[PDB]
């Protein structure tokens, strides 16, 4: 609110039509922070057009990488938030931070699993078990990487075998399906298959289809 007797403030601060961002303890912030126009890049001294330390800079249509965080900047030099389309792919950036999404995420009551802003396709572990995040158009015109209805059915993907119960979640552990015993690994829900596996200090032989030989 107030200023200082070098200048200090709190929050987003305009000085001679340059943008700066202060933390509530009056210290200047370097990074991507939210202002009234969106998230901006408050850059270290001398990153573009001889910008002063902590000044928001021109930075257009390109990614930005700070620490282990990824951002995407549009034409107006603000970081995309939410769903954005970069070279034909849909990425997602957290609205609160502008940082790329990672892990399990619900968005408009739809479930996705993100790596570096990108929805991954495959079988991953959400809070309610392993779901099938599927290619686009697999079931009920779903979007790329969206968890889909998948009931009482096997799935082959990336040379692995999964079985999905009535709740569209992948089963884990010892299972009996149509008279056959499988063991789906708790870590990945992948069937043990095509040879010999140690399960709980015991070797078993599993066929290529993942069915345990008695």
């Amino acid at each position, epitope marked *: 609110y107030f200023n200082t007797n070098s200048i200090a403030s709190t929050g987003y601060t305009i000085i001679n039509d340059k943008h700066f961002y202060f933390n509530t303890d009056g210290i200047m912030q370097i990074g991507v922070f939210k202002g009234p126009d969106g998230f901006e890049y408050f850059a270290p001294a001398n990153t573009d057009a001889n910008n002063i330390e902590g000044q928001a800079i021109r930075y257009q249509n390109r990614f930005l990488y700070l620490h282990d965080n990824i951002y995407y900047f549009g034409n107006n030099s603000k970081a995309a938030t939410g769903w954005v389309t970069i070279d034909g792919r849909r990425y997602y950036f957290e609205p609160n931070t502008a940082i790329g999404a990672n892990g399990y995420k619900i968005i408009d009551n739809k479930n996705f699993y993100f790596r570096n802003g990108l929805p991954q396709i495959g079988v991953f572990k959400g809070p309610n078990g392993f779901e099938y995040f599927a290619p686009a158009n697999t079931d009920a015109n779903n979007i790329d990487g969206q968890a889909i209805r998948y009931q009482n059915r096997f799935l082959h993907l990336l040379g692995n075998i999964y079985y999905f119960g009535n709740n569209s979640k992948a089963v884990t552990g010892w299972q009996t399906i149509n008279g056959n015993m499988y063991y789906f690994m708790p870590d990945t829900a992948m069937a*043990a298959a*095509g*040879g*010999l*596996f*140690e*399960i709980d*200090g*015991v*070797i078993y*032989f599993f066929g290529v289809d993942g069915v345990k030989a008695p």
Partner: nanobody
Amino acid sequence: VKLEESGGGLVQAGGSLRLSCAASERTFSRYPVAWFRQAPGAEREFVAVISSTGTSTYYADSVKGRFTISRDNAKVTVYLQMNNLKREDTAVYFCAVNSQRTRLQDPNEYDYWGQGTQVTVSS
């Protein structure tokens, strides 16, 4: 990191050798260990594997009843007891550790190996 084999060499048929696979770290006890064997330049073929616990074992049909695999976790060592030795058992013998506990009959799946010990059977 790190397997040392010993107990091979020359031996008349019908005879017996005991192979050893000594490990460097005590973390060896966590994983199943196996013996493989290759004839010159040809395949590394599956011989036997034993569970991490030592409780459970699986053998190739060609050595079943003649070979016994076992481990002393206190000594961090895996043994292959070879009895009834045929001439056909002539080969280099390798022991190998498998971290993923997966597809144990497949050499490729293994992470660590010993140097190999030569076994030669006479007549």
